[PDB]
Amino acid sequence: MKLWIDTDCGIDDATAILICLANPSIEIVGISCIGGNASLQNVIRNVNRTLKVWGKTDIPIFGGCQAPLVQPKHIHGGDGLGDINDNDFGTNTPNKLEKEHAVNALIHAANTIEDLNILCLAPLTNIAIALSMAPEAILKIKHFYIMGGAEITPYGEFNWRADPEAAQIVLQTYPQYQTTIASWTLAVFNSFNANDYDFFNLDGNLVRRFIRETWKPIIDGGRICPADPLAAFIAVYGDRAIKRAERLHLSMVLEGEKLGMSLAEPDEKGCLVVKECDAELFVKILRELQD
Template structure:
């Protein structure tokens, strides 16, 4: 598995799960500007890996800007440093010298040569993945599966129409969806329809905090407490971690294969994922747009408590 991240509180939750769950093999992490500027994303990512004791996993920096637009960030949600302003020490491990696109290409090609195609999990704006698709289409074709956090069939957050990751770089998402259709790479969309449902309570956070002082328990507790305060709630979502959990427990999520497009030019709807839920079994020739090329397994329902337990149990077991 490869994670592409813009770490981010919820990306940090996903990294914790990817590092610690015994059924997951995290081979590389690539970083992109998004929730925070790229240097902060890289630092936050290295901090999480060090807290989890997985300093051997290569981390590479990628795109700092979207393909076309000026960058925006979400530090108003994730804190000034992008990861809950916890005041953790600077990581002692360094970033890989390779560009993220090269780390992606080499890891994908290596896994393919071993007969074990990699699962790519973008949890951020898909700028890096779009660049991979355009620069190295042969490598893109060797991806076993893409599970991305982004979009939504019925729910939005960055604007009234769009989810943040897609809104940040809609062209990149469109490139990746088109390339996945061209190269027969299966895609699952873990979007806002399910994103908020796996939640950790403040009581859960207190339990995590007691597990260690500078490990995944303390980190997870700090992240959840920060988000609970930010939203004035007694619980917080683990967000992106649900997309990783789907790989471990797919039965906890109901998906439906649906045509998906990205709106690129709407004045008020730019960045919206157009999830076509119509019945296409009949004559749809009257629709001038026709059927979207990309057929995506869209997550529509989730057992939130089950996914939250998986995340908590993974940290508990790793901290014993």
């Protein structure tokens, strides 16, 4: 599976990225960066940290837009990655960043790489702009896997509320039938008690140290809500990752008091909205990658 990743690399992004790095059947052809959890510069820094920790700097990193499309301007720390110390990980080395804008690089990849899939872990600003400039190219992409949206209070949702116009563009331009959704609701339904589960609190190697220290601030009232990892889990392990799912046509509320929330109607040509995951397989995947 050839996979592009769009990220606002904060903490759960980095672990999502590791889930893709760990599967040998996955080929990451590019990572685009967008502001969100942290500034665009911090996101590029943090993608670099994540790749350097895993030991595969083989993947081109593209910088995207710095702000949401229309809406004006944290939890993942000051640096967006749990305020970790580069000297404790050996990641105080120059960062790689390609010259092409993330929008142009994604268009070129969609135009030239066959059977390209995309994993969207962030507000959809880069994607929406790409769809605006070359919809024919982006429409060549085989499948969209998106973390975002909510049905558990919806006010925990970040990606689509952060740029509801970009989400609307995606949802009305790229075919929803070829779209799978890992929602914020799903991240809370499949959440774990960190007083009962230890898979984000190991040591022995660089990977475990990285996961343990990055997740510490996010672990919320001591719960692990693994939104972006679940999205990567679904993208990489397909139907085996999914227990329950429903087909829903989705749209953004772009005005009024519910601005940024989403509307969903049962529709068989709509998004595949995952409603429950295989948590046992999920944890096993998380543990295996930390070997």
